[PDB]
Write a protein that holds these residues in place. Structure first.
Motif, PDB file in Angstrom:
ATOM      1  N   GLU A  51     -62.194  16.219  79.606  1.00 57.43           N
ATOM      2  CA  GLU A  51     -62.451  17.607  79.924  1.00 57.43           C
ATOM      3  C   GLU A  51     -62.741  17.729  81.410  1.00 57.43           C
ATOM      4  N   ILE A  52     -62.287  18.835  81.986  1.00 54.17           N
ATOM      5  CA  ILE A  52     -62.526  19.151  83.380  1.00 54.17           C
ATOM      6  C   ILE A  52     -62.950  20.614  83.399  1.00 54.17           C
ATOM      7  N   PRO A  53     -64.246  20.861  83.630  1.00 55.23           N
ATOM      8  CA  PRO A  53     -64.755  22.237  83.569  1.00 55.23           C
ATOM      9  C   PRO A  53     -63.982  23.172  84.477  1.00 55.23           C
ATOM     10  N   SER A  54     -63.876  24.433  84.048  1.00 55.69           N
ATOM     11  CA  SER A  54     -63.056  25.468  84.688  1.00 55.69           C
ATOM     12  C   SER A  54     -62.983  25.378  86.207  1.00 55.69           C
TER      13      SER A  54
ATOM     14  N   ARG B  13     -53.781   9.569  95.992  1.00 57.82           N
ATOM     15  CA  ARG B  13     -54.486  10.825  96.232  1.00 57.82           C
ATOM     16  C   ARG B  13     -54.984  11.404  94.915  1.00 57.82           C
ATOM     17  N   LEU B  14     -54.142  11.354  93.894  1.00 56.89           N
ATOM     18  CA  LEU B  14     -54.576  11.753  92.557  1.00 56.89           C
ATOM     19  C   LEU B  14     -55.847  11.035  92.078  1.00 56.89           C
ATOM     20  N   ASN B  15     -55.943   9.732  92.346  1.00 50.54           N
ATOM     21  CA  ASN B  15     -57.095   8.921  91.951  1.00 50.54           C
ATOM     22  C   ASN B  15     -58.385   9.295  92.682  1.00 50.54           C
ATOM     23  N   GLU B  16     -58.274   9.525  93.987  1.00 46.27           N
ATOM     24  CA  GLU B  16     -59.404  10.018  94.770  1.00 46.27           C
ATOM     25  C   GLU B  16     -59.920  11.313  94.160  1.00 46.27           C
ATOM     26  N   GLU B  17     -58.994  12.198  93.801  1.00 46.82           N
ATOM     27  CA  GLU B  17     -59.352  13.472  93.196  1.00 46.82           C
ATOM     28  C   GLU B  17     -60.027  13.315  91.831  1.00 46.82           C
ATOM     29  N   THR B  23     -63.957  12.250  86.458  1.00 49.38           N
ATOM     30  CA  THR B  23     -63.189  12.144  85.228  1.00 49.38           C
ATOM     31  C   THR B  23     -62.453  10.811  85.230  1.00 49.38           C
ATOM     32  N   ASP B  24     -62.274  10.231  84.053  1.00 51.79           N
ATOM     33  CA  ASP B  24     -61.612   8.942  83.968  1.00 51.79           C
ATOM     34  C   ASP B  24     -60.141   9.105  83.641  1.00 51.79           C
ATOM     35  N   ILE B  25     -59.328   9.226  84.683  1.00 49.65           N
ATOM     36  CA  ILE B  25     -57.875   9.254  84.539  1.00 49.65           C
ATOM     37  C   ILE B  25     -57.339   8.455  85.711  1.00 49.65           C
ATOM     38  N   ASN B  26     -56.590   7.387  85.426  1.00 50.60           N
ATOM     39  CA  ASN B  26     -56.021   6.564  86.492  1.00 50.60           C
ATOM     40  C   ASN B  26     -54.523   6.767  86.629  1.00 50.60           C
ATOM     41  N   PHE B  27     -54.065   6.883  87.872  1.00 49.04           N
ATOM     42  CA  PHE B  27     -52.645   7.042  88.175  1.00 49.04           C
ATOM     43  C   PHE B  27     -52.182   5.865  88.993  1.00 49.04           C
ATOM     44  N   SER B  28     -50.968   5.399  88.717  1.00 49.76           N
ATOM     45  CA  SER B  28     -50.384   4.319  89.510  1.00 49.76           C
ATOM     46  C   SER B  28     -48.869   4.301  89.377  1.00 49.76           C
ATOM     47  N   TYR B  29     -48.192   3.813  90.416  1.00 41.59           N
ATOM     48  CA  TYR B  29     -46.770   3.508  90.292  1.00 41.59           C
ATOM     49  C   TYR B  29     -46.575   2.068  89.820  1.00 41.59           C
ATOM     50  N   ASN B  30     -45.756   1.891  88.791  1.00 40.08           N
ATOM     51  CA  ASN B  30     -45.473   0.565  88.271  1.00 40.08           C
ATOM     52  C   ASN B  30     -44.075   0.086  88.658  1.00 40.08           C
ATOM     53  N   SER B  39     -53.308   6.376  82.755  1.00 41.62           N
ATOM     54  CA  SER B  39     -54.118   5.745  81.718  1.00 41.62           C
ATOM     55  C   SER B  39     -55.481   6.404  81.524  1.00 41.62           C
ATOM     56  N   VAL B  40     -55.973   6.356  80.292  1.00 42.39           N
ATOM     57  CA  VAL B  40     -57.339   6.759  79.970  1.00 42.39           C
ATOM     58  C   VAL B  40     -57.897   5.739  78.980  1.00 42.39           C
ATOM     59  N   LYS B  41     -59.209   5.521  79.008  1.00 41.55           N
ATOM     60  CA  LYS B  41     -59.867   4.600  78.079  1.00 41.55           C
ATOM     61  C   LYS B  41     -60.115   5.262  76.732  1.00 41.55           C
TER      62      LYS B  41
END
Lengths: 73, 73
Positions: A51-54, B13-17, B23-30, B39-41
């Motif tokens: 979740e990411i608040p509004s 940049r997405l990861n810094e954000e 929030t736990d969301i990881n982005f990467s190029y494979n 990915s999310v846990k």
């Protein structure tokens, strides 16, 4: 501000794009927790959610707009 | 057609954000599957992963810039 209509709309568009591609990732506005909810099903078929608040969601979508601009435009 | 460097910057940049929102969301190029890995846990700490092939990720990102553009300001 009024965050519901726009995150609702942003969700439909995101989901259409995700379904155009075939990636099991879902977006929606939750009015109960007042935030954007992204959800994927894990290995067992069970939903894992983030979740990411509004307010944090609208700022994030904006910062990504400009990053995406400089990277791809 | 040189997707790699743009997806890497994006992920970075997405990861810094994501880290900014906590929030736990990881982005990467494979390199191997040639595309975006997000990915999310799950409940047990195991990464749930979704992969978006290079070309379609750029597409996704490109037209997400537009809808964000319209929806915000």
């Amino acid at each position: 501000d009024q965050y519901k209509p726009k995150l609702e709309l942003l969700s439909e568009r995101l989901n259409e794009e995700m379904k155009r591609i075939g990636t099991d990732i879902n977006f929606s506005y939750n009015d109960t927790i007042k935030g954007l909810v992204v959800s994927v099903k894990d290995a067992n078929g069970d939903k894992v959610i983030r979740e990411i608040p509004s307010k944090e969601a609208v700022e994030l979508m904006q910062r990504m707009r400009d990053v995406i601009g400089i990277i791809f435009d």
